């Protein structure tokens, strides 16, 4: 369950194992990195070595460095404790608010629901916004495109969607800033603090 780094080419790390080869999409932790480097196995190359993609920077790595296989995919913390927090890809808190103390961890690669687990009725998710609930209704499980540029209340609409769903339906929300700018992310986080959806020390967070 312990391997060694064979090759380092950009964000691609080839790591060679001895006894047990980790499966695809498993997470391997580099043992010499102080901000810990998690590598996700993308493919098996044969010869007991696997090709992995890096979740963080790669400068300073040396060949032969010890990598520990977790035996599972990237398990991120989940629960009510992650509400109002900011996490990176691997679940570490990056909002300087302390550790995320939880009891539930879940892998980020799971299976889709089956054909018998799906409802035949195409129910709509009522969101309490009159123009949305009348002219362009939101379907449960659907794909929704929210347009808007600068100067329009797109952020305010997003937070109103979060607040109305948490109030009318009792369901929370998750925001995922996939490749977002740091300035826009900081503005969104401070607007979420100001408008009360993200609440510090009150545990009334909704996103």
């Amino acid at each position: 369950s312990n391997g060694q780094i064979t090759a380092v080419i950009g964000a691609v790390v080839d790591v060679q194992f001895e006894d047990q080869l980790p499966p695809i999409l498993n997470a391997l932790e580099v043992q010499g990195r102080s901000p810990r480097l998690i590598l996700e196995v993308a493919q098996h190359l044969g010869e007991n070595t696997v090709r992995t993609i890096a979740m963080d920077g790669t400068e300073g790595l040396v060949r032969g460095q010890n990598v520990l296989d977790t035996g599972a995919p990237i398990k991120i913390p989940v629960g009510p404790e992650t509400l109002g927090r900011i996490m990176n890809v691997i679940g570490e808190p990056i909002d300087e608010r302390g550790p995320i103390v939880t009891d539930k961890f879940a892998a980020i690669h799971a299976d889709a629901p089956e054909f018998v687990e799906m409802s035949v009725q195409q129910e709509i998710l009522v969101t309490g916004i009159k123009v949305v609930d009348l002219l362009a209704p939101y379907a449960k499980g659907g794909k929704i495109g929210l347009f808007g540029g600068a100067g329009v209340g797109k952020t305010v609409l997003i937070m109103e969607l979060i607040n109305n769903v948490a109030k009318a339906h009792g369901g929370y929300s998750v925001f995922a800033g996939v490749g977002e700018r740091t300035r826009e992310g900081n503005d969104l986080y401070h607007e979420m603090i100001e408008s009360g959806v993200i609440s510090l020390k009150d545990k009334t967070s909704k996103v």
Binding site: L21, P23, I24, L25, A42, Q43, H44, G46, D111
Partner: protein, 90 residues
């Protein structure tokens, strides 16, 4: 004396019927390359250890490229793949 030595050398390794059985050299993205399956045919259905199905599409000199009829998470490198003996049918 020499023949017994080479028999011991052969017996140091496990016995595998590579004509009808194969070991997964690499499994990923629904496509598995296997060492073995010497009597496999083109487009022939195969069964994995986990119960999944596959189709032998590429007949390469070194390995056999098989497209997996299902998720590849249930297949590990070194698993046993056996021929169904027939082309893919429904």
């Amino acid at each position: 004396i020499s023949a017994v030595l080479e028999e011991k050398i052969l017996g140091a390794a496990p016995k595998e019927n590579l004509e009808e059985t194969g070991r997964v050299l690499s499994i990923g993205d629904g496509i598995a390359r296997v060492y073995g399956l010497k009597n496999i045919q083109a487009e022939e259905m195969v069964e994995f250890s986990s119960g999944l199905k596959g189709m032998a599409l590429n007949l390469e000199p070194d390995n056999v490229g098989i497209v997996v009829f299902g998720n590849d998470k249930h297949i590990k490198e070194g698993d046993i793949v056996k021929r169904t003996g027939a082309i893919v049918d429904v």
